[PDB]
Amino acid sequence: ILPDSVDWREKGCVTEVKYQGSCGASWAFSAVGALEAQLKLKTGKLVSLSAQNLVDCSTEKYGNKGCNGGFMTTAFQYIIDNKGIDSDASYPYKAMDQKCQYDSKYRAATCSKYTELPYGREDVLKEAVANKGPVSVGVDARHPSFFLYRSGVYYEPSCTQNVNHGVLVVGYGDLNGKEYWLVKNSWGHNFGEEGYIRMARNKGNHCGIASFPSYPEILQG
Ligand SMILES: CS(=O)(=O)N1CCc2c(c(-c3ccc(C(F)(F)F)cc3)nn2C[C@@H](O)CN2CCC(c3c[nH]c4cc[n+](O)cc34)CC2)C1
Structure with missing residues (x-):
């Protein structure tokens, strides 16, 4: 029996909204966001993880191109292969491609697998958001309505199921009869509701929100 509403901010699993700047690294922010929640569930400690570490180190082997885009799935694979990711504090975000400077001395999380x-x-996404945690997803963000969004449940008739921007589903619910997904973006606090957007849910995979969902786990064995 799934809850009608969930918000992982209430469970202490969501870090501050980040600002990616002019670097096209939304894939990296989406990935660290999903892992941040799993780390909190494991250790009780909420810590921002290094998007820069992914930008600089999860590169050609993972099909990623740093500030020119990439994928959450293969970001997770890098963290698995590398046996760690640094904290954001130890390896801060510069919104540029840099030489890989991963240091196991500042490892703040690991990842065992991703799904x-x-x-x-959207039914499967709902279950995962309720029972596993925040889920990394892609959305179609290429419409002025998206970048100008301030509040309410976002519905854009021209949205497609083809995705181009990585974000994090941290919840879901309903707002005055409109079902929504609660989405953490990486465009700082001046986007949407202090960095969040509520996007139409159960409206035929609106803006491709359920096209490419994935989430990491931190497991033994
Ligand atoms: C137009 S579309 O929307 O239909 N779409 C098409 C299909 C798609 C899209 C995204 C998608 C797009 C954007 C985002 C976001 F913006 F959020 F970041 C998220 C997902 N994923 N896939 C699934 C896989 O094709 C992605 N796969 C392909 C192999 C590739 C790769 C190259 N070298 C490698 C070395 C090692 N490995 O392991 C993999 C590779 C990267 C992983 C976009």
Whole structure:
């Protein structure tokens, strides 16, 4: 039996909204956001993890291009392969491609595996958000309505199921009858509701929110 509403901010699993700047690294912010929540569930400690570490180190082997884009799934694979990711404090974000400076001395999290959810399945996404944690997703963000969004439940008739911007689903609910996904963006506090957007849910995979969902886990064995 799934809750009607969830908000992982209430469970202490969501760090401050970040500002990616002119670097196209939303993939890296989406990935660290998902892992931040799993780290809190494991250790009780909420700590921002290094998006820069992913930008600089999860590169050609993972199909990622730093400030020119990339993928959450392969970001997670880098963290698995590397046996760690640094804290954001120890390896801060500069919004540029830099030489990899990963140092195991400042490791703040590990990742054992990741899971991809099936294309377009908002019911499966709901279950994962309720029972696993925040889920990294792609959205179609290429409409003025998206970047100008201030409040309410976002619905854009021209949205497609093709995704181009990485964000984090941290919850869901309903606002005066409109079902929504609660989405953490990485465009700082002047986007949306202090950095968050509520996006239409159960409206035929609106803006591709359920097209490419994935989440990491931190496990023994
Ligand atoms: C137009 S579309 O929207 O239909 N779409 C098409 C399909 C798609 C999209 C995203 C998608 C797009 C954007 C985002 C976001 F913006 F959020 F960041 C998220 C997901 N994923 N896939 C699934 C895989 O094709 C992604 N896969 C392909 C292999 C590739 C790769 C190259 N070298 C490697 C070395 C090692 N490994 O392991 C993998 C590779 C990267 C991983 C976009």
